[PDB]
Amino acid sequence: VPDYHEDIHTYLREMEVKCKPKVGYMKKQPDITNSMRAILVDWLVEVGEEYKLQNETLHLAVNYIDRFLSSMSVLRGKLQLVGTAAMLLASKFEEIYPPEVAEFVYITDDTYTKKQVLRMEHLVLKVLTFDLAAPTVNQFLTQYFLHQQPANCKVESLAMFLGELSLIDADPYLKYLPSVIAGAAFHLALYTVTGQSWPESLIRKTGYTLESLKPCLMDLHQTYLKAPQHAQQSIREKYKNSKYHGVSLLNPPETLNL
């Protein structure tokens, strides 16, 4: 029921600051690198197709890894383990029935033992102090969408697409809150498909002027424009499928009218 939004929105806009990763964490990390991080999130995007997981599970899972690496240094050899226990926690928090651990040990090619995965779940838990109800881009995209006159499922499918792209690269994106990334993704999706503009309805709800969106909007444009060329492709290959109206085939606008 529409009696409870605002309160949820406000509260999501509050919870989002406390669940925040450190913006320059990849650079205090001795062994691992933004591109290792890209490879990892790409693999997790693909793990989710194989097991027909929900998209929030993938968003949630990345959040864990980022908040995990903001206080734990990891070797490049134990990253895929840190990633696996995130997707299992995320799975266990969000999915109706999650994959078995065996399945989570199998997605990784008998790399880590089932026991290693499990007692890395406990360590993830310890370090985030059982704070898993993290707000994510996908959460805010959904809360928008409601403001969409006329409704239209290519915008929705395309904003989701753009917002997953931003999971892949922390390079720019880790200095934006999900509420803004979502905002920037909703606008770019809407501007790409219809030509319309980030509406005044949620300029009041969110306090987000188009102008205030500008910076992350530019970043998320470039990222869009360059998507087909990117080292990672798992997301684009997933948003090819007609589950999504092949949003990812649509042609970026090489300008933004800003």
Partner: peptide
């Protein structure tokens, strides 16, 4: 999929 890094 072992990720080699």
């Amino acid at each position: 999929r072992r990720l080699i890094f």
